[model samples]
Target chain A: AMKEKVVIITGGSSGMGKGMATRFAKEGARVVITGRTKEKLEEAKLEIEQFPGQILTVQMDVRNTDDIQKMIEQIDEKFGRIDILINNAAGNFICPAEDLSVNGWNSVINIVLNGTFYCSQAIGKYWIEKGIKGNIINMVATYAWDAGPGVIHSAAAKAGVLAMTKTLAVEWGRKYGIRVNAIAPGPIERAKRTIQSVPLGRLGTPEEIAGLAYYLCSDEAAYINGTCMTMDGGQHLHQYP
Target chain B: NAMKEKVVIITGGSSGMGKGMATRFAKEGARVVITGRTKEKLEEAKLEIEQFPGQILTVQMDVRNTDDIQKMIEQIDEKFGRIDILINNAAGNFICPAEDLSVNGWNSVINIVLNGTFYCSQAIGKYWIEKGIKGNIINMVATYAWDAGPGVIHSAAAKAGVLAMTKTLAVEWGRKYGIRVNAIAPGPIERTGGAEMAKRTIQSVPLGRLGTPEEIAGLAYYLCSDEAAYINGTCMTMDGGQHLHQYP
Candidate 1:
């Protein structure tokens, strides 16, 4: 059971990460949520703590590696140990390849790809040193597997995240006993950005995304390592043409 | 226009389904390097396919032999100066329980399918990096690569590993050397040897019919074309919704 397990969620202020935090907290885990906005994190904490799960909110910009290091230290001090790390923080803008500026591309890459690597490295190092078998669930998009043209920045970052997820899963599986896998959530219901592009005819709920994350982070996923499980209502089934 | 003049190396290009793809590639204007162990079958295929591009170099190459692949590419480079596409289509398998399958079967498939593919991709990728030329690699994997095949554990494991490798190097070499790595996990495609086996498998699919080679070729051609420039590290499943089966 994940009861009493300590879980760290990046970008947990809203969307899939918020739902995951609430679910984990409900399942008896002490959930710590990090986001760029303090008010949003506080609101999420207030909302998620109504369940049986414990909650802590931290305002953190994942793009800063120093902030990630401090966040790890804080988690260690409060919870004493972390069993799960969910890399869910990301940034995206829809623009064609030719129209996307280098700065625009860098902004997304720094948060999505580079920040994921930063948090992963920090948590992985702690787990490795403490002799704990860490579980990492990277939130990826379906387009990571299927690179659509309009979202080149997201495509490249998510693709990089997938590669990094697999590389660490294989390399660190034996070395650190760290099990890492990625979850590609399909178009979840997002009022911030609606998805008519999803194949399921309707957007997936954040609860569904949380259910998948919980399943992946659960103990039952022992054999399921170094894999990217795509849960996008068959959204990736189209030809790019 | 990647027709007839482009030199392409297709591993396991002797008979069965490999020859079928080779025929299409020949017809499309590519100089083919047919690699396989059976010299007789390779020569026969070469003779039969002389009508297309007519310049078929039958290389008695084993997929497991990294040295053989290196030498074959070296020879191809010596003759053609460059290779536009490298299709890692060679594979070996036997359907048996995970516990019942022999170590030899596991090692054979892993060596040929997984290791051999890396060797060829590494060799060609190194060349491309050196020459400053981008190359497209197409791998033929199975639907079981992701979903996990029941009876065919070895093929499943090997194909899964190959898919991982494909995703790895697709990003590893995407911008550095301009290598676009992609995989095609075909469902039960109609083939001479697998015709009877496909009949049983086709029933499980939602499409209720086996896939055709030409259909696969169409996707393959689209991927290699410049139109698919932004596409990298992708595995397209043209399985007619076999993997999409959800029990109600």
Candidate 2:
């Protein structure tokens, strides 16, 4: 129903992914959000549709390569072209590494690492063939470069995704002009000294991260590639306990 | 060599403190599983460990391979019957000016040190918890994990993550499962091979000599002992007060 530019955001039904979809839609981009939950996706579409841009909610899971392929085809048929993809779908829960179940470990890895790979490759192949020069922004964490402690599974998967981002940046950038980058959001709403630990002295909000995602995928961020810009309220600056 | 019937696992046990700890624990009548990426190195370590009092199983697998870790755990479980302690000691590094660090170089080290450590810990930790076994985990981190390693940015970041992971597991697992998690921030150990930069670091150590792997092995052994039953979430620095020298 719309095509200023087609953008796909996985897991755009809630949290930071939903917030990013809102920002992109407000900017009048035809945004497609793929999520697992139907009601939540519809609700997010309702919220984003308030803006000038068109919003399409597709019920999907990032973990399934086949589903991702189908979603890519569906979005292409509707929009006629794609401009960007944000790999934001992730899974996590606080379980000690010791007590974590086999299913718990594999589930997170499948969703985060494999799903990111699946989405990127499928969309990337489409872009390369169509010569769209699309952009990709992966959602990772400070723990990707560091570690997540309580959330070890997510951290490992995120770390793998970061490396994949870099590898794709060079590989895809050289062959095609696709720009690949990442955003590492610190605790949003989230901690005690965790606040002051950030010299900025505040926890970040989803809207703030959404704004950064918007800027990164914008024409202004054209020169940025293989960079993981952290909007952690300046928390990375020092040691705080 | 008197911790009868106990079984311990040491990652990176092919060399350095990994092998040292493996030797010490094996000497104490504990069955040891030593893992490494190279089969020959692991075999060599096995020969050395067997010279001690207990059994040794050498597994060749890269810690970076998440699936490899689970498989290694399966092998250990099958052979040893149980796992009592884990030493997350496998690490990789090189001194590159952070600016010149390439994606290939950076990724290689990060995967080995940061991700590999987690993969091993999670597999073993889950096994212990499911079995209701009160186990111990010792993460070989570094002072720079919390401080500064200007040139070794990748290792520093990865090791810092390991330290945070250590403290987190100590709190999360210790309370409910009685599993103690801790770390050792060793300044520098001989035969670990950083060469010229190693000279600069030694001067900072008031003790005025590089610590031996055996000395660190001793510390690790003590941590796993009942004598250290109350110590959790603590990073016992074996740096000869190097962490404090500059500030003082």
Candidate 3:
């Protein structure tokens, strides 16, 4: 059903981004994976080519506005239309709140939260110009709500993303039919490098994460907008009954 | 001394977590007052409390009606002489998508959860003022109350309002009225009623377990105790990092 639709995935070079892009590609979508590393993007392109979907790998830093502009121009030229934009790029490191450097916090916020907003703004303006209903899915953490133990910077940034997700979800869901939603995946059981901090026993796989993301962007979830769906196997709920 | 000696009044105690909390608080050391529209459940819970160390009182009062709450307050003050603590647990909840929820439902929940919390806080706060007694007020809120849960539009907005009231009034009344107001947000806690709504699906929870009522009561006990005097205007969420588990 996603056939012929252009989907831009930020941070699609590797890890969770690759997984999400791969799933979209499988659904017959034209996938463009964007990241700062050309080698990684090329690697992702090779991996995506094995699937049935179209792939355009671009090496660009999501935090750079000019780079984002170029990426948008490329998308507009190649596809003539962009159906969905996935703000999946992120940065994080474990450090206590008291000890965390402002630079560390800024780095994550710049790449994760601010970059997502800039890309959305740029793509949204383009989508609006063409009068196309655009869908945007942001990858945010559940710590945005609870404020995790050591990852306070990520927590704060993700919290900002959550608020931004809601604000944009509400605004865009009504005005532009631009269904905006976010997903918080619980620790997947996959032996991911990010799994050590999870309260849940297992890490989540990219496949499991892809399933929900696809549904949200699909027609099945048209009515579900301005919302954040979390898939963390009850790790968040285990605290109180 | 909790069940026998402490006086606990649960606004909107006839249903939901209010009933659950009142039942548990009555077991501890509080003489519990259960208020709601239905007299039957309140009386039934009151009867259940009598089996414990304390007396149980049932009052059929709507939280939205200030006069009704006032009358009940007069009765409690006349009979018991002093109010030690108040649990602002009254609420109205129904899950409807944000666009589909009725305005009436939204207003009703807001009035009950938010305004009702204020009314009871002010009433009991006045009593504590006259008696010069420091008391505790526990408001039952939810994770969506903060994170803005998707389906239940009314409850999310109202619970958030209640949370704000808890914080603002906690500061206003903390030192003056000796009234400490705090909210306990329980995440996916298992309940006889919620069992149907809760289905154990893979990738749903990080902990892969549901919370128990007794576990929530533990946190409540900590907040209501003299030791937690420093904890005020706080909405402590007991949901296993459900709000934190971003991707599963």
Candidate 4:
């Protein structure tokens, strides 16, 4: 469905961002990949080129709005028109609330929350003027819906990004032909090159959920609804578990 | 008391998980009533379960046909004198993309999985309430119900609807009728003669193995047992962490 259309995926050097790039490119979209380092961006371009889609690499940090404007201007000259923007660039680290410095806080906020707005409007403004019903996909974390213990900064930023996504969705959708949305991923071990992401190091079994189900149906588990027990075998946990 | 002469009704009990459950319940000395659209398969299942300690009665019926569902309920009640448990195990599914799914393909799954479930649940629920039979129900669901279903969107949508019905009926029926309703979401199982699959299927599962129909059957039996009287309106996922691992 994305044939010939230009789609930009930030942080396309690795992880979920790269996975999406592979998909959009497979659909014959002109994929523009952006990363902080030129080497990684060039490397990503080489990988996506294996498929039929055309690839353009832009080495820029989403945290810097100047880099975004320059990249957009450069892409405008190359592709002429940008059809999609995915603000998937993200940065995070574990630090307790007390130990977390102002710099640490701003670092995540700038890359996640502020960068989303930066790229969103940069493409959004162009689409609005061109009367192109452009689409924006902001990749947020599942932590936005929960109390993220160590990564409070990432949680706050993603929560803001999610709110901005909906807010911008209504604002842009009403005034201009623009759509904004967010995808909150739980835990996905890379498919192409399998990542040992699950802490159990192994996936769960059908009997596992069945045993839990039987226990719940028993008189033993009477209070488990507002008791949402995520029997995900620690897939929701990353790095620390 | 759990399965000793306990009257149980299982839909689509002629094969797969349904047949497995019928065998399990029958082994526990329960008088099991199994229904299927094919009389031939039902007869085969009857002979298989009849060898066990409990009695087996095969009913030729289809969940897609509410007329057969109504008649089956009446017939089972008349024969057994009272029904203690009802398992909605009939389902239809195949791997097909959403856009490519034909109109007829969509309706068939919706009618069998979603509407068929409602038909049996409503008829059985009413039967229990009117007869003052404090019976329970078990609805078979899957991991795709809550998560993304890229391959089988039809089954996913239908099963997701059934999960909602499970919780809603748990509260609605449990409040006044004392009838418990719950669902089981099992993952990929390695069958004795199952189709050969990609290594990714096994690799994706955290347990590093496929589940068995017997495992699901064991879970279903426990849900209907008196030990699970208070457990109502919840779905248990037995997917070997496949929901956590994203292959598609």
Which candidate number has the best TM-score? Answer: 3
Query: What fraction of the true Cα-Cα contacts (under 8 Å, chains A to B) does candidate 1 also have?
Result: 0.00
Best by lDDT: 2
Candidate 4 lDDT at B97 equals 64
Candidate 3 lDDT by residue in tens digits, B134-168: 88888888877765466776777788888888898
Q: DockQ scores for all the models shown?
A: 0.04, 0.01, 0.08, 0.03
Per-residue lDDT for A1-241 in model 3, tens only? Answer: 5886888888888878888888988888898998887888888898876454378888888789999899888877887879989888988777867887878888988888899889999998998888988899988887777647678777877888888888988887778888888899776543454444444556678898888888988787888887899987655653322
- Report the Cα lDDT for candidate 1: 0.82
Fraction of true interface contacts that also occur in model 3: 0.11
TM-score of each: 0.54, 0.53, 0.57, 0.56
lDDT ranking from best candidate downward? 2, 1, 3, 4
CA shift of B203, model 1, Å? 33
Model 3 regions lying over 4 Å from their true place: A50-53, A189-201, A239-241, B1-248
Model 4 chain B worst lDDT run, 10 consecutive residues: B190-199
Clashes of each: 5, 3, 42, 12
TM-score rank order: 3, 4, 1, 2
Error of model 4, residue B39, in angstroms? 1.5
